[PDB]
Subunit: 389 residues, 4 copies
Amino acid sequence: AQPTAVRLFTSESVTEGHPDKICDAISDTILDALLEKDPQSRVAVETVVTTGIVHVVGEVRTSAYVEIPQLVRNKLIEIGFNSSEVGFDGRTCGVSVSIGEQSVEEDDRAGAGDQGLMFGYATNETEEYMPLPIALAHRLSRRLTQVRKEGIVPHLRPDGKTQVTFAYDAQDRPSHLDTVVISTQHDPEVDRAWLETQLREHVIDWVIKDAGIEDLATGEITVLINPSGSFILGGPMGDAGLTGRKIIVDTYGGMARHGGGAFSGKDPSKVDRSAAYAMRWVAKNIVAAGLADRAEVQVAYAIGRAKPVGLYVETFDTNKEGLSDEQIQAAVLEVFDLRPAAIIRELDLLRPIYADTAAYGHFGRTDLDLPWEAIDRVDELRAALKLAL
Amino acid sequence: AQPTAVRLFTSESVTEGHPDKICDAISDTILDALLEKDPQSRVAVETVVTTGIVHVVGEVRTSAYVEIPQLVRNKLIEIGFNSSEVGFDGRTCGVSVSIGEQSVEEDDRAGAGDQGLMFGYATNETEEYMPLPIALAHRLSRRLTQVRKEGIVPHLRPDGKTQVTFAYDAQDRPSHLDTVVISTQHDPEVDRAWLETQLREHVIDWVIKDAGIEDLATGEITVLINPSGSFILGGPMGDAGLTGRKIIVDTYGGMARHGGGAFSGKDPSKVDRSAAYAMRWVAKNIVAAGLADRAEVQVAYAIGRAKPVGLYVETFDTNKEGLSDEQIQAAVLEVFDLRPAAIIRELDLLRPIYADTAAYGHFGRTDLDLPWEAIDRVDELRAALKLAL
Amino acid sequence: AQPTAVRLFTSESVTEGHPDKICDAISDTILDALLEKDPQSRVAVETVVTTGIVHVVGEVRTSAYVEIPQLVRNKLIEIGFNSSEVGFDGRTCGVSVSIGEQSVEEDDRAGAGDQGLMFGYATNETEEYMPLPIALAHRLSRRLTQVRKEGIVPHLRPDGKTQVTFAYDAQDRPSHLDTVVISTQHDPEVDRAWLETQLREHVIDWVIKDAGIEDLATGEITVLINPSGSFILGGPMGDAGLTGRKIIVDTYGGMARHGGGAFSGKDPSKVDRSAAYAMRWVAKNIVAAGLADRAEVQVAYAIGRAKPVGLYVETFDTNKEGLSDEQIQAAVLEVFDLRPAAIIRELDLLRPIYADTAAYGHFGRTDLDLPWEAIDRVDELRAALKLAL
Amino acid sequence: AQPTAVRLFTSESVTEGHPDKICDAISDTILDALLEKDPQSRVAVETVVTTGIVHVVGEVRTSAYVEIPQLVRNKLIEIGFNSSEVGFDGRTCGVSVSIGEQSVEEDDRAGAGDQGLMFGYATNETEEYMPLPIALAHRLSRRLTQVRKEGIVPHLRPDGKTQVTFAYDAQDRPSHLDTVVISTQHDPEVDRAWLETQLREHVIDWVIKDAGIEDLATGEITVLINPSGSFILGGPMGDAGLTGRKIIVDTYGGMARHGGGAFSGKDPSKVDRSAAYAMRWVAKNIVAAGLADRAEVQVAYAIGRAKPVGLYVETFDTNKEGLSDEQIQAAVLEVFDLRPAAIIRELDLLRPIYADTAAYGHFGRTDLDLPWEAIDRVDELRAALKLAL
Ligand code: NA
Ligand code: NA
Ligand code: NA
Ligand code: NA
């Protein structure tokens, strides 16, 4: 009868050298430097980059002493922006700071510092409990940076972007890898032709095997490398960057819903970051407890109130043990303390662990030890639901 | 058996006086001023505000001559930031500009200027085809600004935020208004007690009737006004703002998925904005054609390619006429040209219509005449699907 | 025969509220804050102000920890810029910092850090060894600020300027006060008419008596107060300010020659400041030793060399004891060690004494205890010249 | 009897690549670009440079449309700052603009826009009527830039400084060249040893002959080239620059007195620039009319008044024709209209001639055709004094 089209779902990542990620990384490098000397630091630090300029703005309350300019310059050199020839130089660029520095009992009862909504998500489709499209995109962006830093593929520059499109079935499940896009900055000594062969072998094919998805990468797949052509100049020049402009890359690649809150530059007292981490923790435990294959949980808060005004559990009809999302939600309310101060305490968030989160995703990081990734509430959830352990 | 909790879903809005929205508004005021003199202007303008400072950065290619500083200062005075006493003054604040100005046949075949994914959404639960929680939040933020500008409620200041939590049923449908939060900046002559009575009557109750949701606002509802207490100082001072930091408020309040792209400061050549508008157009027409009650469509693009690499139609089991989402998607591919240049042409996007979008939502605006809100593809969709008109 | 005109010589001062002096004061407040915690601080700090903005730039090498933004804001409130109504507000203005913090035996032999020339001057026409025109202008600017801060004259604002013109004789000597100009910022509650009566009595007439110049202020003198009319808005708005843009007001009002070097923002290792202070010390001692009535000494230096490349003593034919300027210069070379490290040691310059110098003149300050004002080399100079003590 | 020392007088110049001169040049490039399209442009433009940053601030009232960022970048490339390797790059540096653009009969009677004093000077010791020390320093700085741009001496970079010390007699007259200092930025391929031979021959010796001062350059002269050693990195990085920080280099090298006013960035309506130019015109005509060998004239003004409040002619006992400085001054008052609008009209100042003045001196420029250098009032002065023509 009426023709059917194949539904194609896409997620993207970027390198640490994409201007938005430079900002997220600088914001979180400042936050770590402050939490290292004063774990109680309140931090709302935003970064903006444009041609030859890094502008850091916002508010800090801290007892720590940190040199922000040297932190900025060293982070840019670590990413690889070390020359006017590459379009940006940590050693010779402008750095400007406009930050204002001034003007368990009660602890767990402190109000949210702001209103807002935050979402968390988990799926058993990958070992890291992450949607396949975003996971593959992050692996590709990380591998692109690795081949450059380890010299596996030479003549590469820091700025880069990755995009993965997967065909899906009528049940909303991933079926086949359809299209992979990789755009990387490079030296004038190399061209798209050289990059096409180098990246398809050392980045795309290597990641397909490293991720064990060969079964989804069989057949015909479109590979586009530098489809726009030469990419010699990259970074802030001709592409302004700002902190909190890659919130979907930082989370689940669009597979999960988002509340709009950015994470980088914010200390754990900001529900925009802490509550999103708590929701990832809750969702992962819900799936790890065998209550569902996929779970998305929204939490919401009123300024000056510790208890959430909202909570919303969705398992997309993958609910198990004959339990409804309403029943799973009641078990979440019994097991998890979602007051801001309780989240900081239970996840031990007052440590300099954030700069690592500021590129390649906050969630499903096999390479990091992040507390919101712990499946340490499975027994509590099944017990609360009167299920066998 | 195991206890059930009520699922509670939340969406928020902000006034034009919230620092992030000041940035979005200034970005889009610059874009309109350029499109008014040169409809072909290429515009990537980002705004950052902090204490006493407005910093505009990015790239313009235009034949137009516009005075950016006066555009900034006049827009701040229009929002109401006109005094150090209010925390920010359009007449005496810093304004800095770091913008680089330099360095139908083929038309419809031009490549996307970037890769990326964009989502569009529509629901028949409201006349404006918008999710109820975000629609109520936008109505509250708009009414809060209106009562101040028209003097219905005196002693109010520009900065404000609104949040609405709705109880939902097991079928993922809104059932009852549960909690409304309103936080507004104000003069020292008034306090939370005075605001509680004034806002609950002139803003919350007025909006409930104006929106015809009295049937969902019966019973017990929690109303919180300035729950954190006094809000005399607002705007950029002590709360830095950046363009593209309210993308969920700009779209569907978290009910729909998002690709991460910000809209303000970008000319229609940027798929981050144009493709999101096209997806709203497609989704609204899908629901207006009676093919579904709710529809979310993702579109994706590779840099240097005109045809999308991806498209993904989801109607959440509300599909009608015995049609699958695969069949609806094939009809969307027959009816809609989703090449960037085709979207600009069919929606007539090369006009100064964007500043109005930069607060109170880009979608479901009864007060504006926006081309992506037109249900002018219903006949084409039903025809393509061989349905009666 | 051919007609004679009366030669009229002019010098000016400004209040601490003039935008250039705001910059000098902020630069020297930062320098003092650093010298207070680390007397070895190397400091090259420049300040720029414009509408709503304070931008601090340059280089520091220090072990000290100081909060520059709070130092800026507190200094602006001390001057009186505390409202958008006054045109500038220390509490709500932008503050941006772009300062790089990184990348006796030998001591007295260290090279000059730069080349350059510096002049010093002294005259016995006043008790403070200062030219009469600049001394009167400084007294007027200080009195204008005092009447405002002590409330002697109400409704005054911080920004102000003073100018004094004196008639001179054919021997280049001051003969009579001819014209006094005072321009002050003010509240809208007062006008030029009210200021004319208030300032002429509480500022001009009071200073004439306080300085004991009634004998030069007899007869007809032109007094102009706010000759341009209203001065409600002042400070950086509509009048950008920069450090080192009032070098003549900082020195001798144009009576003496200048080498071009600014003083504020520079630690004592900078010959631009230290050598100018040494030349004031030498000139004052030359006149205090009875070797001349007026003396101007230029000193010059090559980068990487401790000994001056030049020295130039001029007494304008006021030389005494039958000694030439060549003979006085030889005695200066016997008495004074003018190597940069020797100047720092002999004048004890490594102390937070500079913020006080940053308005109302570096020289002839009766209200301060500055080491370059000490006449403690008179005995040494007369001895070296084989004169009676 | 008491020993005599030789009095040694010093003046300095800098290249167009010294950071202060970069600012003066950018300020005056903006002013020319505006005067070229709108000769009535009111312009108060200040430039600040530091590592990787160019910040332009102030006020413009104009009908002209100019692209300030491209003017900045092109001027930096013209000076030679075109690489991170050289320490600064016009193509990749930050450029920020904070300029406010808003908020014959009567003509000749307009008030001075500000109070202030300004000095002019002329001497017959050189053909250009300039003091020998500053003239030689300017010739050396210009030659240093020329050898680099024409490739006479390779491996040179833009930043450089020159200093000349001359021995003087007891009559205050130059007697012999004593010390010449040249410090130039350079490539790592060359060292001080190579520069010592190249600059002493192609710059110092060439200038001595080009200026015809071989008679003052006989005997023993100290030549110091890069006495501090290597100078690979120069420009704004590690040496902040500001407009109006080289006012002595711009005028007479300290031989003449100064009122403190900077010239660059100011349109001819600013007496700080116009009145200083008028005083150079008056002084040069006084000496060219045979009334003196050396002449210095100070002029002063009250805000809102067209007629000077002061004028002061000094010829240092070099007065001729048995005329006093009082008599010469009366003749100056008969011959010259020194109202601001009269100076603009008589010197035809409303033209884009200022960028050329912004390095290598405003006065005695043989290479430019500047109206304040015209000796076209000699006949009028001698006539007024009843002398033979
Ligand atoms: Na579905
Ligand atoms: Na559901
Ligand atoms: Na004289
Ligand atoms: Na003399």
